[PDB]
Write a protein that binds this ligand. Structure first.
Ligand SMILES: Nc1ncnc2c1ncn2[C@@H]1O[C@H](COP(=O)(O)OP(=O)(O)O)[C@@H](O)[C@H]1O
Ligand SMILES: Nc1ncnc2c1ncn2[C@@H]1O[C@H](COP(=O)(O)OP(=O)(O)O)[C@@H](O)[C@H]1O
Ligand SMILES: Nc1ncnc2c1ncn2[C@@H]1O[C@H](COP(=O)(O)OP(=O)(O)O)[C@@H](O)[C@H]1O
Ligand SMILES: [Mg+2]
Ligand SMILES: [Mg+2]
Ligand SMILES: [Mg+2]
Lengths: 19, 371, 371, 371
């Protein structure tokens, strides 16, 4: 009921291609 | 804050800033996916190519249009189009910039609902608006009254406006535009011997239609001319270097716009659609719609269409009325230019759909706030 | 831990490490067995001779090639080839090094099954992998797109790759390469009075083919030139001391690559095979592929082949295309160099077939894991 | 005067008289030419063999197909096909007998031009007509409404007809049929070690496809069953006496008809083609089209195809529709049987294209008169 009240309250890419 | 105008048309996304004269980012709305087997490891192998990159690498891609006849079918693809046109083309943050979108009339409402929900939850804005394209075209024409035939790549719609009062019972929608012309050109190019079956070849046939096709003034005389002598024939070079030569198919492809029964549709052409949209209006304003036939859209960019439209409406109208087709040279981007009017107007600043109004009213304020 | 690259071609095993420029061990894959009555006891007599030793004592041996047209028939001989190239040529432990092997396209699957079985059970590895040779050739050319004509000793295949995406329906395979040219030169060297019928004499005719032969630019004009004047005739010295002299057979032997009907085959030449493998691809990418003809293998090491190939492709293609052929001077071992590209890549560490996956799935995981 | 029906298919010519149940002359359309050096003088050595003679002596011949995907490329070879099928098989004078022909839909028009020109000039008939094969299949089914999937050796086309009224905007052509299946079986037979490269071997692989292959009801369960146990494996005897044994390749060969991406084609299978051709039609005829799926052609002669087609269409259609695949046992020749209907009708006699109309209007009346 407390959880219901709280819940519903109203770069790597360029280095790869080079290598 | 400067605003954004992003015309999400069926064929070409036209996006850019407010107050400008020309659209900054014009790119086609296709999403490409690789259909073969990759053998080279690495190399930045993306699972999807969006836009002009999908135009560039198109020999190994399947291209999917997210929009068909003004209705967004695939929504993740449309999210990828919006992500590309915000982050890659414009390089803008949508959390600090307003956005005006254009929409065809007589659209299903859930398209507008999911457009509003994606624009307010995934690319969440301070404000956005959804407008009618014909009102923006009549803004860009510089006049208050007029009938607008707007024909993009999926939707040809006629909307008349008199003194800023649109008549909603005279709006006439026809689902015939340049993608159906592309498919009919792919159908009739196989008569001469040239076969185009894949989605990559649709762009080549669309480029043939954009470069070579034109609206005939008289279809029977042009067919007799093309049957008699080979003066109307024109040549085009394919990307592999082969040269094709086409004849009467230059003008048979836009003739579907005046005769839909070539592609099996029962409905009449655009000239009787415009004439019935005129005759559905009240009797005092029809003369003021006879002299202000504003054309827009890229499909009205053929260099024979205004004289043919004037001839057909002058044949349909009574003879004591002046027919004047308003055909600006910049009618291709014109709806975007109308957004660049309407984002810059001082009276439009109270007509934004704000984020607090959306969070208060759910996704239901877009029907009562817009048209 | 460095990897191993071992191109097991039909004629020459090219083996070595990864990360190195030159192949460390290049030696032909022959197994010699004695065919005469041994009369001296002792003297280091061996029941088998593998490699250059079998090239050294080839007058008193029968030489067997374990690989014919990419398909290994005798498997104990292939085990002796692998044991010689691991323990004697390279002198390394195969239990502590991964080993990449190459393969012709459209090879039978049971060859890959028995290769995986012998690599995991007789010469048991940390890992192994089976790759395509044309991908390594396109790695050695330094580009991403291109069509590869590889031509070793048994298999000549055309593989087109665009942006790292191979087209598996456009791969073409022809069983015509330098061993068939050596047998055709053995057939036509009996025209001038020189008889070569043994397997020892095939090495001498292969040396004549390697040293003196060249590709004519035009076959009919060069045949008329050789028939008219004795200017193209060259002399070669046999190892016993005899001197032979040959004329038009310098350019009749590699003409069979451009004309297979000399040796009675229904298949077309390598230029029409390259043109058909280009024309089987999609129409957008062909302008790249005409600019990126990549040749590899020792059979393309004749000093007349690139100009003849450019003339034939330029005659076949339309005139608006730039016909470029990339033929590097180190194209004899470049496939191996491409293996030394691929095994030293950081992204290739995840694509190895381990011992544990082999013991899980049997010797059948190499079909689903590789190409 | 008894008419003639000559279905010039892509793989097999089927010719015969009208008023007959079975086709009299069924023979494959190949033109053979000898590729070897004839050494025995005399003995009636013909330079070309046409038809079953080309099947008889095929070890020393290169066989050429004059028709590729419904489009006749080589026209002198097609004249040899027509001269053989008139004078040798049927043994008839062409100038005293009318001859209906058949044609694939969406054919290039110059094929029809040259077909009419050779049929009116070389083999000068009194009258001829060019029709559509699917209308003949719907004639031979006995019904009036229905959608026809006709799949031959080059062309698989779907044509819907309701009450004698075709819908030409829903005709869907796919260039994937039994020659592509024969080439795909030639590609996948090399996994087991059997190599088939020449055109003589293509007849052997086509005979293997005709005898042993079948359509799986479910592809994945059949693949798991063939991978698990060797119960589906079958044997076949080659003409040299070697025995081959095949497993999953019995059902991997026609599975390209339901998944074209095996051979690198972007388009969807024949079931999605049939469903999209049904959904392209008007709505009120659709219940008549779901209940009358008529199949014809030899490519629909596998013994699993009707249940798979019913399962796929019932998966695609809504659940309240009665799917009924009409699969007669005589569907291999059924198009010819429909020609035997249409040549024998009393109302067809006014619809002949005469010699006098040809001489009046050139070779251009075949577009205006036929469909
Ligand atoms: N110059 C031209 N001539 C003929 N047709 C054109 C021309 N320019 C564009 N088109 C057609 O118009 C369409 C573009 O119109 P547009 O309104 O920009 O489409 P969208 O906004 O839906 O992408 C394209 O699909 C193209 O086929
Ligand atoms: N310089 C050369 N000129 C002409 N032919 C050559 C030359 N070098 C090698 N060859 C021939 O080309 C063939 C291809 O060599 P290679 O691809 O290394 O064979 P494999 O790798 O299959 O053993 C060799 O069998 C050889 O006969
Ligand atoms: N029993 C069979 N099973 C599967 N395919 C077959 C069988 N018999 C014939 N075929 C295929 O049908 C083709 C012949 O079709 P055909 O009657 O010529 O159609 P079309 O006349 O439209 O070309 C052949 O190429 C063959 O591959
Ligand atoms: Mg638009
Ligand atoms: Mg090699
Ligand atoms: Mg047929």
């Amino acid at each position: 009921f407390a959880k219901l009240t709280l819940a519903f309250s109203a770069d790597s890419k360029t280095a790869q291609n080079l290598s | 804050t400067t605003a954004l105008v992003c015309d999400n048309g069926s064929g070409l996304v036209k996006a850019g800033f407010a107050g400008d004269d020309a659209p900054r980012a014009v790119f086609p709305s296709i999403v490409g996916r690789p259909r073969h087997q990759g053998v080279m490891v690495g190399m930045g192998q993306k699972d999807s190519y969006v836009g002009d990159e999908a135009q560039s690498k198109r020999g190994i891609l399947t291209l999917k249009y997210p929009i068909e006849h003004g209705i967004i079918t695939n929504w993740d693809d449309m999210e990828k189009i919006w992500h590309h046109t915000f982050y890659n083309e414009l390089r803008v943050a949508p959390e600090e910039h307003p956005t005006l979108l254009t929409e065809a009339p007589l659209n299903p409402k859930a398209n507008r609902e999911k457009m509003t929900q994606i624009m307010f939850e995934t690319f969440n804005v301070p404000a956005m608006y959804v407008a009618i394209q014909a009102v923006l075209s009549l803004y860009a024409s510089g006049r208050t009254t007029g009938i607008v035939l707007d024909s993009g790549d999926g939707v040809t719609h006629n909307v008349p406006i008199y003194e800023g009062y649109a008549l909603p019972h005279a709006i006439m929608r026809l689902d015939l535009a340049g993608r159906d012309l592309t498919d009919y050109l792919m159908k009739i190019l196989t008569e001469r011997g040239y076969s185009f079956v894949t989605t990559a070849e649709r762009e080549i046939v669309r480029d043939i239609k954009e470069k070579l096709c034109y609206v005939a003034l008289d279809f029977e005389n042009e067919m007799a001319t093309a049957a008699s002598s080979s003066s109307l024939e024109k040549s085009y070079e394919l990307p592999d270097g082969q040269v094709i030569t086409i004849g009467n198919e230059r003008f048979r492809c836009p003739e579907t716009l005046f005769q839909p029964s070539f592609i099996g549709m029962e409905s009449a052409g655009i000239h009787e659609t415009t004439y019935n949209s005129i005759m559905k209006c009240d009797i005092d304003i029809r003369k003021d719609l006879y002299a202000n036939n504003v054309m827009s859209g890229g499909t009205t960019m053929y260099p024979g269409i205004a004289d043919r439209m004037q001839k057909e409406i002058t044949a349909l109208a009574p003879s004591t009325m002046k027919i004047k087709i308003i055909a600006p040279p910049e009618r291709k981007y014109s709806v975007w230019i109308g957004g660049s009017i309407l984002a810059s107007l001082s009276t439009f600043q109270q007509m934004w759909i704000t984020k607090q109004e959306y969070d208060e009213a759910g996704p239901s304020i877009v029907h009562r706030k817009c048209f």
